[PDB]
Amino acid sequence: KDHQLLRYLLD
Amino acid sequence: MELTPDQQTLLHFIMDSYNKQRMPQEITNKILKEAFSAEENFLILTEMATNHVQVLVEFTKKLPGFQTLDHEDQIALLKGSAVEAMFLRSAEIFNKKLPSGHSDLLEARIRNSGISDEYITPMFSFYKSIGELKMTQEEYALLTAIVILSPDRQYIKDREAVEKLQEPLLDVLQKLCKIHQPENPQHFACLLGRLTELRTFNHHHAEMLMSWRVNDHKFTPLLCEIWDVQ
Ligand SMILES: O=C(Nc1ccccc1)[C@H](C1CCCCC1)n1c(-c2ccc(Cl)cc2)nc2cc(F)c(F)cc21
User: Could you give the count of Cα atoms lying within 13 Å of B103 in the half-sphere of its Cβ?
Assistant: 14
Q: Which of B27, B98, B104, B147 to mutate to test the pocket of ligand 1 (most atoms within 8 A of CB)?
A: B27
Residues of A within 8 A of B54 (CB-CB) are 9
Domains: count for chain B: 1
The amino acid at B24: P
DSSP string, B35-51: ---HHHHHHHHHHHHHH
Ligand 1 atom with the smallest distance to the CA of B36 is: 14
Ligand 1 surroundings by CB, under 6 angstroms: B 27-28, 31, 41, 44-45, 48-49, 52, 86, 89-90, 93-94, 106, 110, 113, 115, 208-209
Burial code of B14-28, b = ≥16 C-beta within 10 A, e = fewer?
beebbeebeebeebb
Does the distance separating the beta carbons of A5 and B225 come in below 8 Å?
yes
Resolution (A): 1.9
C-alpha B104/C-alpha B125 separation (Å) is 14
Question: Domain containing B164 — which CATH number?
Answer: 1.10.565.10
8 Å CB contact between B45 and B218: no
8 Å CB contact between A10 and B61: yes
Task: For chain B, give the residues followed by a break (C–N over 2.5 Å).
Answer: none
For an interface test with A, the pick among B50, B51, B57, B230 (most A C-beta atoms closer than 10 Å) comes out as B57
Boundaries of domain holding B14? 1-230
Binding residue per annotation — B159? no
C-alpha B33/C-alpha B201 separation (Å) is 28
C-alpha B158/C-alpha B146 separation (Å) is 17
The amino acid at B215: N
What kind of experiment solved this structure? X-ray
**Which one, of B124, B161, B121, B169, lies nearest residue B143 by Cα?**
B169
φ/ψ bin of A3: left (φ > 0), alpha (ψ from -120 to 50), beta (otherwise) = left
